[PDB]
Amino acid sequence: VKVARPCRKIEKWTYLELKGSKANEGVPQAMTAFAEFLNRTGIPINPRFSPGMSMSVPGSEKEFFAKVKELMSSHQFVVVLLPRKDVAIYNMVKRAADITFGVHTVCCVAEKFLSTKGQLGYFANVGLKVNLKFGGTNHNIKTPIPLLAKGKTMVVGYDVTHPTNLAAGQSPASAPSIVGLVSTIDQHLGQWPAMVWNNPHGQESMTEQFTDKFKTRLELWRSNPANNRSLPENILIFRDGVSEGQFQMVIKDELPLVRAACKLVYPAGKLPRITLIVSVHYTVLVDEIFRADYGNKAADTLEQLTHDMCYLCPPAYYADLVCDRARIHQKELFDALDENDSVKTDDFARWGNSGAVHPNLRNSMYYI
């Protein structure tokens, strides 16, 4: 089963074998079969890999980085075989590849990759990921809701973490938080570029950054050849992570920042229609799109729309994945929170900068 839209050519790739208790055999043959399968599904990966590297996992993260630096810096892609399902090592590999060196990776447990029985299905899944990471689309929806069809609607999802420890009367709103955001860039809905960021003073920082951040999403959509310099006319927005209470906060302290970004980018009086929905069922907080166009059938048109979306819920799920990966990226912060439970706001900010995805991967689905 092929892919709807093939990713970019993958010319230079290799493998990194992290040794476990039992030694692996047949790895390069497996890498070859892997690449063959990807090609068969229409992913243009070079059948030929540059010779891979095998090593055991070093004691420190700096040693690891030092060992993988040249391999990771010189390839577009690395398939990493872990010796066992070990999230310390997974997390280290992702910090190395996503952050420090900036190269796409897939992490596969060696036993699963090398196991002949069931191998093709696993290769199918990894291949789906590879196709997305490199810009392609996997599935086509047979019947898109009129509203998505026209190619005039941008979909956005974000979630906000708040992983501080609140104590001693510390204000909740001022509490440090992390935002994860994804959005679509075309009518096809395959690609969902992400943004992450830190709010060291919470809502004060959200207020300072959100307008400009959303502004980048609008700019990303408009500069896509597919859309022909069109700003989306509609914007559907999913917010995760909020209790029924915080609904007011989202409406009052977040949605206006999006409105401001639109006011900054859009022709005067031509601002797009916006619908805000929160996931955590789904609850529509604001709708300018569905009632307008579909009257009584609005609700069902949106439930059909979000059903069409599940075809690949994605905006909210992807945003969560983005947050989780951010949590993996910012090791200094979480290590500190395991110990002291308290961290300086300046530490929050600079650890946000240090744990930012490498620019090589900036608009990519690295989190997938």
Structure token pair of residue 134: 């490199």
Beta strands 153-160; 234-240: pairing state? parallel
Are the C-beta atoms of 92 and 68 separated by less than 8 Å?
A: no
Are the C-beta atoms of 309 and 315 separated by less than 8 Å?
A: yes
Beta strands 153-160; 177-183: pairing state? antiparallel
- Residue pointed to by tokens 């890999």: 49
**Dist CA 14 CA 125 (whole Å):** 18
DSSP secondary structure code for residue 23 in this structure = P
At 193, is the secondary structure helix, strand, or coil?
coil
Residue type for position 171 = S
Q: Where are the alpha helices (H) located in the chain, listed in sequence order? A: 27-40, 61-73, 87-94, 110-114, 119-133, 146-149, 203-222, 247-253, 255-265, 290-294, 298-310, 314-329, 331-339, 345-354
Structure token pair of residue 64: 């690891």
Query: What's the chain's length in residues?
Result: 368
First to last CA, the chain: 20
**Dist CA 149 CA 308 (whole Å):** 11
Resolution (Å units): 3.7
Q: What does the H/E/C string look like for 99-150?
A: HHCCCEEEEEEHHHHHCCCCHHHHHHHHHHHHHHHCCCECCCCCCCCHHHHC
**Dist CA 110 CA 83 (whole Å):** 6
Q: At what angle do helices 331-339 and 345-354 cross, to 10 degrees?
A: 140
Structure token pair of residue 154: 């941008």
Nearest to 357 by CA among 162, 181, 223: 181
Give the Cα-Cα-Cα angle 26, 29, 31 (nearest 5 degrees). 110
Beta bridge partners of 179: 160, 197
Q: Considering Cα of 141, then 145, then 151, then 154, what sign does the dihedral take?
A: negative
- How determined? X-ray
Sheet containing 53-56: give its strands across.
53-56, 13-19, 77-82, 104-109
At 239, is the secondary structure helix, strand, or coil?
strand
Nearest to 24 by CA among 92, 108, 129: 108
DSSP 319-352: HHHHHHHHHHH-HHHHHHHHHTS---HHHHHHHH
Contacts of 118 by beta carbon, 8 Å cutoff, 6+ apart: 112
**Which residue segments constitute the domains of the chain, with CATH numbers given?**
1-139 (3.40.50.2300), 140-368 (3.30.420.10)
Structure token pair of residue 315: 């905006």
Nearest to 21 by CA among 86, 88, 78: 86
**Dist CA 100 CA 151 (whole Å):** 36
Q: At what angle do helices 298-310 and 314-329 cross, to 10 degrees?
A: 50
DSSP secondary structure code for residue 269 in this structure = T
Beta bridge partners of 19: 56
At 53, is the secondary structure helix, strand, or coil?
strand
**Dist CA 61 CA 59 (whole Å):** 7
